[PDB]
Enzyme design. Structure first.
Site, PDB file in Angstrom:
ATOM      1  N   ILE A 288       0.850  -1.216   0.000  1.00 33.01           N
ATOM      2  CA  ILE A 288       0.000   0.000   0.000  1.00 33.01           C
ATOM      3  C   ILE A 288       0.877   1.254   0.000  1.00 33.01           C
ATOM      4  O   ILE A 288       0.299   2.344   0.037  1.00 33.01           O
ATOM      5  CB  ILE A 288      -0.980  -0.017   1.193  1.00 33.01           C
ATOM      6  CG1 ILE A 288      -0.264  -0.054   2.550  1.00 33.01           C
ATOM      7  CG2 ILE A 288      -1.957  -1.163   1.022  1.00 33.01           C
ATOM      8  CD1 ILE A 288      -1.156   0.242   3.752  1.00 33.01           C
TER       9      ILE A 288
ATOM     10  N   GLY B 274      11.709   2.415   2.630  1.00 32.81           N
ATOM     11  CA  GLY B 274      11.227   1.049   2.388  1.00 32.81           C
ATOM     12  C   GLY B 274       9.772   1.034   1.954  1.00 32.81           C
ATOM     13  O   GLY B 274       9.395   1.856   1.111  1.00 32.81           O
ATOM     14  N   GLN B 275       8.981   0.118   2.518  1.00 35.14           N
ATOM     15  CA  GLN B 275       7.624  -0.216   2.049  1.00 35.14           C
ATOM     16  C   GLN B 275       6.627  -0.205   3.217  1.00 35.14           C
ATOM     17  O   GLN B 275       7.023  -0.269   4.394  1.00 35.14           O
ATOM     18  CB  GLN B 275       7.648  -1.614   1.433  1.00 35.14           C
ATOM     19  CG  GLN B 275       8.653  -1.739   0.310  1.00 35.14           C
ATOM     20  CD  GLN B 275       9.002  -3.175   0.027  1.00 35.14           C
ATOM     21  OE1 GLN B 275       9.595  -3.871   0.855  1.00 35.14           O
ATOM     22  NE2 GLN B 275       8.650  -3.606  -1.174  1.00 35.14           N
TER      23      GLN B 275
ATOM     24  N   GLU C 190      -1.419   0.989  13.725  1.00 37.74           N
ATOM     25  CA  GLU C 190      -2.857   1.070  13.395  1.00 37.74           C
ATOM     26  C   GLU C 190      -2.981   1.424  11.913  1.00 37.74           C
ATOM     27  O   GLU C 190      -2.188   2.268  11.421  1.00 37.74           O
ATOM     28  CB  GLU C 190      -3.573   2.101  14.276  1.00 37.74           C
ATOM     29  CG  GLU C 190      -2.927   3.473  14.278  1.00 37.74           C
ATOM     30  CD  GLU C 190      -3.590   4.458  15.229  1.00 37.74           C
ATOM     31  OE1 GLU C 190      -4.808   4.267  15.494  1.00 37.74           O
ATOM     32  OE2 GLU C 190      -2.891   5.427  15.682  1.00 37.74           O
ATOM     33  N   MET C 191      -3.968   0.836  11.241  1.00 37.76           N
ATOM     34  CA  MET C 191      -4.344   1.203   9.857  1.00 37.76           C
ATOM     35  C   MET C 191      -5.079   2.551   9.893  1.00 37.76           C
ATOM     36  O   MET C 191      -5.963   2.722  10.755  1.00 37.76           O
ATOM     37  CB  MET C 191      -5.226   0.118   9.240  1.00 37.76           C
ATOM     38  CG  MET C 191      -5.427   0.311   7.772  1.00 37.76           C
ATOM     39  SD  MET C 191      -3.975  -0.211   6.842  1.00 37.76           S
ATOM     40  CE  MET C 191      -4.555   0.159   5.185  1.00 37.76           C
TER      41      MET C 191
ATOM     42  N   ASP D  90       9.557  16.685   9.274  1.00 33.61           N
ATOM     43  CA  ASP D  90       9.081  16.405   7.899  1.00 33.61           C
ATOM     44  C   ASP D  90       7.562  16.518   7.832  1.00 33.61           C
ATOM     45  O   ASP D  90       6.922  15.662   7.196  1.00 33.61           O
ATOM     46  CB  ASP D  90       9.603  15.053   7.411  1.00 33.61           C
ATOM     47  CG  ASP D  90       9.440  14.838   5.909  1.00 33.61           C
ATOM     48  OD1 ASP D  90       9.475  15.852   5.138  1.00 33.61           O
ATOM     49  OD2 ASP D  90       9.257  13.650   5.512  1.00 33.61           O
TER      50      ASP D  90
HETATM   51  C1  LIG Z   1      -3.216   3.911   5.180  1.00 38.20           C
HETATM   52  C2  LIG Z   1      -2.112   4.031   6.160  1.00 38.20           C
HETATM   53  N1  LIG Z   1      -2.183   3.721   7.438  1.00 38.20           N
HETATM   54  C3  LIG Z   1      -0.914   3.996   7.957  1.00 38.20           C
HETATM   55  C4  LIG Z   1      -0.376   3.883   9.239  1.00 38.20           C
HETATM   56  C5  LIG Z   1       0.934   4.252   9.425  1.00 38.20           C
HETATM   57  C6  LIG Z   1       1.683   4.781   8.343  1.00 38.20           C
HETATM   58  C7  LIG Z   1       3.078   5.246   8.508  1.00 38.20           C
HETATM   59  C8  LIG Z   1       3.894   5.509   7.407  1.00 38.20           C
HETATM   60  C9  LIG Z   1       5.212   5.947   7.612  1.00 38.20           C
HETATM   61  N2  LIG Z   1       6.024   6.217   6.565  1.00 38.20           N
HETATM   62  N3  LIG Z   1       5.687   6.179   8.859  1.00 38.20           N
HETATM   63  C10 LIG Z   1       4.897   5.953   9.924  1.00 38.20           C
HETATM   64  N4  LIG Z   1       5.414   6.157  11.155  1.00 38.20           N
HETATM   65  C11 LIG Z   1       3.590   5.476   9.776  1.00 38.20           C
HETATM   66  N5  LIG Z   1       1.156   4.868   7.098  1.00 38.20           N
HETATM   67  C12 LIG Z   1      -0.109   4.510   6.957  1.00 38.20           C
HETATM   68  N6  LIG Z   1      -0.874   4.501   5.824  1.00 38.20           N
HETATM   69  C13 LIG Z   1      -0.490   5.069   4.531  1.00 38.20           C
HETATM   70  C14 LIG Z   1       0.598   4.325   3.854  1.00 38.20           C
HETATM   71  C15 LIG Z   1      -0.159   3.358   2.979  1.00 38.20           C
HETATM   72  O1  LIG Z   1       1.471   5.196   3.051  1.00 38.20           O
HETATM   73  C16 LIG Z   1       2.278   6.124   3.635  1.00 38.20           C
HETATM   74  C17 LIG Z   1       1.754   7.079   4.515  1.00 38.20           C
HETATM   75  C18 LIG Z   1       2.609   8.051   4.997  1.00 38.20           C
HETATM   76  C19 LIG Z   1       3.943   8.046   4.634  1.00 38.20           C
HETATM   77  C20 LIG Z   1       4.378   7.049   3.777  1.00 38.20           C
HETATM   78  N7  LIG Z   1       3.551   6.095   3.272  1.00 38.20           N
END
Ligand SMILES: Cc1nc2ccc(-c3cc(N)nc(N)c3)nc2n1C[C@@H](C)Oc1ccccn1
EC number: 2.7.11.23
Length: 333
Positions: free
Chosen positions: A24, A30-31, A98-99, A146
């Protein structure tokens, strides 16, 4: 296994616990995968750190800061994404969250970049100022470093509750390790100028984010550091002498004259792109799209404009701090 990323197979089950659904997210760290935690019976977001030592080192800082936060008693900690646990799997650090729902940039895209209402802008600003008040707790003193629309997520697609994610660039006050930080559009003048920074850089970012949320457009859309600083000067004028006099990168942007005054090197003249006109205070708001609309009066816009100019103070010592921002007339009931 080759490259820095984990090989993710949708359908696989990790450690007889996490059913991997889908990829997602992908970023420099990373991912992010969506997984079903069979033990707690819930969807989770697993952040999978690259197996490269620099990234693992920074993710260990993120884990330490998230565990410091998620352990403080206050209800203010709920504006910060919850780290459920972390583990090593196939030589990657994995952080379980958490999602959440989509980010504030996706919300802008959904409006076809027309912006959200001043009323929804105010709700985002109140929650963000409360999160920054929490980070400023003395025992925390965390700089996010950030803040951008992408790092602010809705809890739920049909509600205005938000949380801040990604403490991957974060440090505590006095533990600065990066001279180059913040996403360029939201980067504070002290960081552009190569100065030491403190919690006030996140308030700069927030000022930028709130204008963009209402207008649909970045306030300061620099192509590079020099363009970024010139776009800031268009709106705010030449920074104070007392700051440029102690800035390592002053001469990347500015030149000192015999008089001891500074001007630009080598755009609208300094301070002539008024926030008054960017916001369309007197001409129906951004692109005239709010003309007459309830909640969008000149009085409303002047309160918003005042708080933004306090967030965009060049001086990090007099830039408005979260407690005081929450006392601003913009928020008064
Ligand atoms: C739908 C969802 N629930 C999430 C819960 C947590 C996080 C998340 C992502 C990162 N980088 N660092 C932390 N500490 C938590 N990100 C979620 N996302 C968005 C994801 C898919 O993408 C994302 C969202 C934001 C940044 C990068 N990619």
């Amino acid at each position: 296994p080759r490259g820095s990323h984990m090989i993710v197979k949708n359908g696989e089950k990790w450690m007889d616990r996490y059913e991997i659904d889908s990829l997602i997210g992908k970023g420099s760290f990373g991912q992010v995968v969506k997984a079903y935690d069979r033990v707690e019976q819930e969807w989770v977001a697993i952040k999978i750190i690259k197996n490269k030592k620099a990234f693992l080192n920074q993710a260990q800082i993120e884990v330490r800061l998230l565990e410091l936060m998620n352990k403080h008693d206050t209800e203010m900690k709920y504006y910060i994404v919850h780290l459920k646990r972390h583990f090593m799997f196939r030589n990657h650090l994995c952080l379980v969250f958490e999602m959440l729902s989509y980010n504030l940039y996706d919300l802008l895209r959904n409006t076809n970049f027309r912006g959200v209402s001043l009323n929804l802008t105010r709700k985002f600003a109140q929650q963000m100022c409360t999160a920054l008040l929490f980070l400023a707790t003395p025992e925390l003193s965390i700089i996010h470093c950030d803040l951008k629309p992408e790092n602010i997520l809705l809890c739920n697609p049909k509600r205005s509750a938000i949380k801040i994610v990604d403490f991957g660039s974060s440090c505590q006050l006095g533990q600065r390790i990066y001279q180059y930080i913040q996403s360029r559009f939201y980067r504070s003048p002290e960081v552009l100028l190569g100065m030491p920074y403190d919690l006030a850089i996140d308030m700069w970012s927030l000022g930028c984010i709130l204008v963009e949320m209402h207008t649909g457009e970045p306030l300061f859309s620099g192509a590079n550091e020099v363009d970024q600083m010139n776009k800031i000067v268009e709106v705010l004028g030449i920074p104070p002498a007392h700051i440029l006099d102690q800035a390592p990168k002053a001469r990347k942007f500015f030149e000192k004259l015999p008089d001891g005054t500074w001007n630009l090197k080598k755009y609208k003249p300094p301070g002539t792109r008024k926030l008054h006109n960017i916001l369309g205070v007197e001409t129906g708001g951004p692109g005239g799209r709010r003309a007459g609309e309830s909640g969008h009066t000149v009085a409303d816009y002047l309160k918003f404009k005042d708080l933004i100019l306090r967030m965009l103070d060049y001086d990090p010592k007099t830039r408005i701090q979260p407690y005081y921002a929450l006392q601003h007339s913009f928020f008064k009931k």
